[PDB]
Write a protein that holds these residues in place. Structure first.
Motif, short mmCIF file in Angstrom:
data_model
loop_
_atom_site.label_atom_id
_atom_site.label_comp_id
_atom_site.label_asym_id
_atom_site.label_seq_id
_atom_site.Cartn_x
_atom_site.Cartn_y
_atom_site.Cartn_z
N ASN A 225 24.95 15.31 45.87
CA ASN A 225 23.87 15.66 45.06
C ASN A 225 22.74 14.60 44.83
N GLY A 226 22.98 13.57 45.18
CA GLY A 226 21.88 12.57 45.07
C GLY A 226 20.85 12.69 46.11
N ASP A 227 21.06 12.44 47.25
CA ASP A 227 19.77 12.60 48.32
C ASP A 227 20.27 13.53 49.38
N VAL A 228 21.52 13.57 50.16
CA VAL A 228 21.51 14.10 51.42
C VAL A 228 21.54 15.68 51.34
CG1 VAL A 228 23.92 13.88 51.21
CG2 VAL A 228 23.13 14.10 53.32
N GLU A 229 21.12 16.30 52.20
CA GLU A 229 21.06 17.90 52.28
C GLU A 229 21.50 17.92 53.80
N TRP A 230 22.68 18.76 53.73
CA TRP A 230 23.65 18.70 54.94
C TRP A 230 23.44 19.72 55.89
CZ3 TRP A 230 26.84 15.63 57.21
CH2 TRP A 230 27.32 14.28 56.65
N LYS A 231 24.01 19.60 57.04
CA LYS A 231 24.08 20.74 57.96
C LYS A 231 25.26 21.25 58.38
N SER A 232 25.57 22.40 58.51
CA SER A 232 27.02 23.00 58.78
C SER A 232 27.74 22.14 59.85
CB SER A 232 26.83 24.63 59.16
OG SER A 232 25.90 24.41 60.36
N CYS A 233 27.43 22.29 61.12
CA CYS A 233 28.11 21.78 62.10
C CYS A 233 28.78 20.44 62.07
CB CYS A 233 27.64 22.10 63.70
N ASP A 234 27.91 19.54 61.79
CA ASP A 234 28.29 18.06 61.61
C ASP A 234 29.44 18.02 60.50
N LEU A 235 29.37 18.66 59.44
CA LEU A 235 30.28 18.40 58.48
C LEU A 235 31.46 19.12 58.72
CD1 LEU A 235 28.41 19.89 55.37
CD2 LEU A 235 29.28 17.80 55.51
#
Length: 291
Positions: A225-235
């Motif tokens: 919630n703080g900063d990061v906006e994520w990518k599907s594959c990397d996760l």
């Protein structure tokens, strides 16, 4: 002295299969309450896995606590340590300062240059308090240093220059007023990671640490919630580990993080999961017989 020699001597002669202490060496020491806080904290942080505690082996109940739980070489070993080993290339590199000295400002500035995290203890009352008040302080700071530590205009000016050069990178500098250690550890680590650069791979190591220590709530509040906006594959890979770890909540966060099981899972992934079951488990015994 090459640090590889130290590594081999720790491995073989002392039969061993990282947190560095660059403090507690001043005349002033921490009180009984504070040694108890740090004692329980080191105990709790160490009882999770098998790690080493790098300290200066110079001098009863706090020793029982630990039991139940010159300068260029140290920094070079830490940098080598943090830099590699000791697809994630980041390990647990940690520095803790207690009761700083004006002679040790050089090692601290050099470690800051090597991008090493640092912990400052307000309860310590040594030269840590100096840097803590220095964050607010702008001369008079060198005078307070000289008075609080009786052990000089030249020394005052040198300490002022060192404090100025240190205050340059206060991102990794975090205050610990013991008056939860795991959470402040993780917060300092994620702050140090985010200070230099923001990226998924960079935060990935801190995420692995959080999963190791199951501080999922802190991880949610301070990272996703703080900063990061994520990518599907990397996760994707991440989930696998959590799935095996019997850590369910993390999985909830991850699907909430936008992980798509419908594409995350593969029959090979399930094959890995099922091959990764407890041999002591009776299910595994029945599987062996069936196969």
């Amino acid at each position: 002295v090459a640090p590889s020699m130290l590594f081999e001597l720790l491995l073989t002669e002392w039969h061993l299969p990282v947190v560095s202490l660059v403090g507690e060496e001043r005349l002033f020491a921490m009180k009984s309450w504070l040694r108890d806080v740090l004692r329980k904290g080191l105990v709790k942080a160490a009882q999770s896995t098998g790690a080493w505690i790098l300290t200066s082996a110079l001098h009863r109940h706090v020793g029982q606590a630990v039991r139940d739980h010159l300068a260029e070489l140290q920094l070079s070993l830490e940098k080598h340590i943090s830099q590699q080993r000791t697809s994630s290339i980041q390990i647990p590199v940690l520095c803790l300062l207690v009761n700083g000295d004006p002679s040790t400002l050089e090692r601290m500035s050099r470690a800051v240059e090597q991008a090493a995290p640092w912990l400052i203890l307000a309860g310590s009352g040594g030269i840590a308090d100096v840097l803590a008040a220095l964050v607010g302080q702008p001369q008079v700071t060198e005078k307070q240093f000289r008075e609080k530590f009786p052990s000089s205009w030249e020394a005052i000016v040198h300490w002022t220059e060192l404090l100025q050069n240190i205050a340059a990178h206060p991102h990794l500098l975090t205050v610990y007023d013991f008056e939860d250690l795991d959470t402040v550890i993780l917060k300092a680590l994620v702050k140090a990671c985010k200070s230099h650069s923001r990226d998924a791979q960079d935060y990935l190591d801190e995420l692995k640490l959080a999963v190791a220590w199951d501080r999922v709530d802190i991880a949610k509040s301070e990272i996703f919630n703080g900063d990061v906006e994520w990518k599907s594959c990397d996760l994707e890979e991440v989930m696998t580990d959590a799935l095996v770890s019997n850590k369910p909540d993390f999985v909830r966060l991850f699907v909430d993080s936008g992980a798509d099981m419908a594409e995350f899972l593969t029959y090979g992934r399930l094959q890995q999961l099922y091959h990764s079951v407890s041999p002591k488990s009776l299910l595994f015994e029945l599987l062996e017989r069936k196969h």
